[PDB]
Amino acid sequence: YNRMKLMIVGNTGSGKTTLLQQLMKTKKSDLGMQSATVGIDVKDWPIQIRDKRKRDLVLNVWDFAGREEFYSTHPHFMTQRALYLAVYDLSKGQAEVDAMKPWLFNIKARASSSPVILVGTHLDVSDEKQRKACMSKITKELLNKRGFPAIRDYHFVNATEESDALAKLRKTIINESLNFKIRDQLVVGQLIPD
Numbered sequence: 001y002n003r004m005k006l007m008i009v010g011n012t013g014s015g016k017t018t019l020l021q022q023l024m025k026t027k028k029s030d031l032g033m034q035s036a037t038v039g040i041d042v043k044d045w046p047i048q049i050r051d052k053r054k055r056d057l058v059l060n061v062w063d064f065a066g067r068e069e070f071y072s073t074h075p076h077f078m079t080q081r082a083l084y085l086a087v088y089d090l091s092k093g094q095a096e097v098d099a100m101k102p103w104l105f106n107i108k109a110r111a112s113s114s115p116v117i118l119v120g121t122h123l124d125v126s127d128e129k130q131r132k133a134c135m136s137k138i139t140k141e142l143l144n145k146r147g148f149p150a151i152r153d154y155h156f157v158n159a160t161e162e163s164d165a166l167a168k169l170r171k172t173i174i175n176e177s178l179n180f181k182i183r184d185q186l187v188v189g190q191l192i193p194d
């Protein structure tokens with residue numbers, strides 16, 4: 001079972017599908033313009049982990065928008081068994097990123113031991129000063145008294161076309177999805193009889 005279980009903290013307009021279509025990418029005259037909504041779904045995406053076996057690990061993340069539509073049930077999907085992704089753009093990185101605190105705390109309430117990584121999508125939405133304005137605020141409020149740890153990492157991406165920033169996104173995923181284990185867990189990709 002070479003699959004990682006995950007959940008997203010973000011909302012419509014951040015750009016998660018924008019990133020994904022250039023990760024979990026297809027052919028010509030298929031993928032197009034992006035939109036957003038709220039409901040419950042999930043997406044399966046391979047991670048290029050090893051130089052001799054790149055195709056061996058896959059992410060499976062639950063997709064929903066950070067609205068009361070999911071938030072009211074969100075506390076019941078919480079577990080150390082899930083890894084978390086956070087997706088905001090580079091304007092939101094300063095202005096709205098903050099929106100996930102009530103979600104992060106539901107995660108915390110069960111386990112804050114599992115990592116969360118924040119990606120700043122739509123890098124080009126903001127200028128260098130604003131991008132730094134986001135970064136320089138986010139990375140200062142990360143750790144606290146009540147048990148919420150600092151984010152494990154962060155990355156900024158231009159997501160609408162083929163992109164090296166997505167390659168960097170992937171590199172980040174490769175490391176965290178490889179380095180993180182829940183106790184000395186059997187690697188999920190092992191002979192585990194369901």
Ligand SMILES: Nc1nc2c(ncn2[C@@H]2O[C@H](COP(=O)(O)OP(=O)(O)O)[C@@H](O)[C@H]2O)c(=O)[nH]1
Nearest residue numbers: 012013014015016017034035036037064065122
């Ligand atoms: N052109 C452009 N659109 C973006 C970008 N990032 C975010 N958006 C928009 O944000 C929306 C995607 O929202 P999403 O994060 O996937 O929310 P979800 O429906 O809850 O998963 C789409 O309308 C995208 O066009 C970007 O890189 N540039």
